[PDB]
């Protein structure tokens, strides 16, 4: 049905009509598309609301457009929608202890509400979960008074219902007709590698589209898929593209003919790739793949972009020996750096188009494991939840001709796991926690109690992730904890 | 702390107070209903005191019936 | 089913489905099982002064039931949501009068309206046990927030665990601080941390709880023991070890009071005087609650799954396991008494 009629038929009765399609609570809050879905889902689980998936989708679309957030109101907290669950949040202590000790603090920041709606929210928490005020970081203080007198007013000032951003967004919001066309994309999947190609977006009913992804990874594995997408609030792109045997969700922000976000497996959000794209019509230079060239070396480098025309210049000391291919969105070439080429970044160019840098290096000095800290989780083995992999990359660092630090990039390496502490050695964590594969992907053990372990415990572990560079054997260290599952997994962490 | 783990360590769920997994429950199933009955970790573990009262219906014995525990978010389809 | 024998020692424990089992302490076997009404949660039980009636906080922290162990009959029932439009929950907060004529419960109510919730101030509600299966508040007083465990002393006074431990008059409802915790302005130390959902009815007749405290991040973590003598009202606190691991429950041996036993992942035996660990034992799995029999010859470990571990407190070794019918004991507290 239409958004307004469904709003009344399904919410009225509990929510009071206030005039021209506005209802109590509902019309006094602004959230992201997944935020709206989460509120409605709570209505079903907690309050018995009867609603089909189709009608729920209709209401989310309606509410996400009417009461959404301006792009700048999501700045810095987009990792939540992008399902980057290993993100180490950086909010003030008051918000962290009071509001981010259960779920993320980003779930809070991705909403805009007046003080009374923030006050109703506090009452709902302590009301729905009475044990709240007896838990850690709550039993040590007068939780309710502090939350109502200190927190509510702060939340209202930091995340108000009304703002210039939202007002100016409602007027400057572009239509979905601005998205169809060809889109050159570039991206990177941790522990897998670079990806590049072209995404064809064609219109469909309303704010939905047909999507076609055509590309490949740097290693030759294909990246071709077909799917669809919807556009919320003029910029919030949500898509699903079946690439091979996996359905990948796309959570991008489509602004100024540029799409930025993340594409991940609908079923496994640790398995994804960073994604940046540019619409045809504007000359852009997206990326260099690889973004590094060892001095005195030969390497196949490919440039990704939009409207590429001209001759590629990779900077001082770097020689373009054979342009293997040159289309407007992809330029493949063979390059060679002199053994004398000075270490440092090079401003790459294709004709007059500049934008990306190429690190020319002589030797690797320091290595950093990315991510430095992460969470792997046991799963499957009959359980209702999947295993959450640890996916790593070895980030190389050196020094340029000026003695300043130089980030080379992600260099190939050998991967292993070692006990993080004496306790891990004693419990034999490295034996039960799972298996580190050569490619840098750690596959945790199966869920459930394990009879073979002390106290028949789970295949959990406190591990040290060691990467050793193929280029010179320089080592890097990371920290990974393999833990238990979680069954409550809403759209936003 | 990580965005998709809890920070309320009593002793915890993803990570204990000590920053590891040893002070946690062994196995986790032994502390599962201790976590669930009073909604101690509602964002990760489903609450049986209020929201998901019959969550462990087919798994009264968590040591042997842990596989019967389902996910709670009403996903499409 | 079978009535309990006089002079015989017994132990009650609640199990998941919704059972209350009677364990014959002499033979370490299940004497009888009673199916409980409604739903389980938390299943926390305490024996009435009659050594025959068990009062249980069940049905998702919203009701209190009285079950006669000799027949498994539901003789009392008090719902904690008697105020119109409000849902009342008890965070393990209930106690039985010394004469067994009244039951107290602090209720944290929430007014649930059509489109929002409103948390209301807590209140103590008194129920007469003679009122049967439809018992309602006969007296109610205002209570501070964050109140959990409560135990009625011999002189009718009610010791209430909240931000501070209070001593409350159940007739006037007036209370004073019996033992400062949050407001324990102890220099060189931080405020203590207390997490306890196990109202042990131990042979020593005292309301005891473990706590942790930082002694000035460089602060030194210590474990302490707090206690309220239910006979004389005498209070006591004292740290007994530097924290190297966590314990959920801890009890002093009725055999040797200078020894305190704590449990969670390991069962530890400490010397109170010396503030020294004398011995620790590894467990088959995590256990929450300790329970000592009358003489202190046995140490039962409950909570968690469906089995009781029986330990010899001297050697600190598991003698046997009592497998309970059904499932997880969860946060239940094993209660020992002489019939
Ligand atoms: C600071 C006082 C807090 C603020 C602000 C918010 N929360 Fe929470 N919260 C918790 C749960 C279990 C849920 C939802 C259930 C689920 O995740 O499956 C939430 C949800 C929210 C929401 C979503 C609201 C909506 O959709 O209408 C918001 C905006 C929110 N929370 C804000 C749990 C907890 C919790 C642990 C006991 C605490 C301390 C907080 N939440 C604190 C805050
Ligand atoms: C009656 C059984 C309900 C129906 C049908 C709907 N809602 Fe509701 N809603 C209800 C209550 C008792 C409450 C307050 C407590 C709570 O769960 O938050 C609400 C609240 C909301 C909110 C506020 C959420 C917040 O975090 O502040 C929203 C945004 C909301 N409800 C939306 C909503 C919509 C869109 C509905 C139509 C599908 C709807 N509710 C129906 C009870 C009931
Ligand atoms: Ni280093």
UniProtKB/TrEMBL annotation, chain A:
Limits of the Quinohemoprotein amine dehydrogenase alpha subunit domain: 177-279, 282-362, 367-492
InterPro entries named among the record's database cross-references: Cyt_c-like_dom_sf, H-AmDH_asu_dom2_sf, Ig-like_fold, Ig_E-set, QH-AmDH_asu, QH-AmDH_asu_dom2, QH-AmDH_asu_dom_III, QH-AmDH_asu_dom_IV
One of the record's GO molecular function terms: heme binding
Boundaries of every Quinohemoprotein amine dehydrogenase alpha subunit haem binding domain copy: 3-166
Domain of life: Bacteria
Keyword Metal-binding listed: yes
Binding positions for heme c 2 per the UniProt entry: 31, 39, 42, 99, 102-103, 107, 125, 488
Entry's transmembrane regions: none
Sorted UniProt keywords: Heme, Iron, Metal-binding, Signal
Residues annotated as binding heme c 1: 11, 14-15, 25, 29, 42-43, 47, 113
Pfam families in the record: Dehyd-heme_bind, Qn_am_d_aII, Qn_am_d_aIII, Qn_am_d_aIV
Name of this protein: Quinohemoprotein amine dehydrogenase 60 kDa subunit
Native source organism of the sequence: Pseudomonas putida (Arthrobacter siderocapsulatus)
UniProtKB/TrEMBL annotation, chain C:
Keywords: Signal
Transmembrane region(s): none
PROSITE patterns for this protein: PROKAR_LIPOPROTEIN
InterPro entries: Host-pathogen_enzymatic-act, QH-AmDH_bsu, Quino_amine_DH_bsu, WD40/YVTN_repeat-like_dom_sf
Gene3D superfamilies per record: YVTN repeat-like/Quinoprotein amine dehydrogenase
Disulfide-bonded cysteines: 34-72
NCBIfam families xref list: QH_beta
UniProt name for this protein: Quinohemoprotein amine dehydrogenase 40 kDa subunit
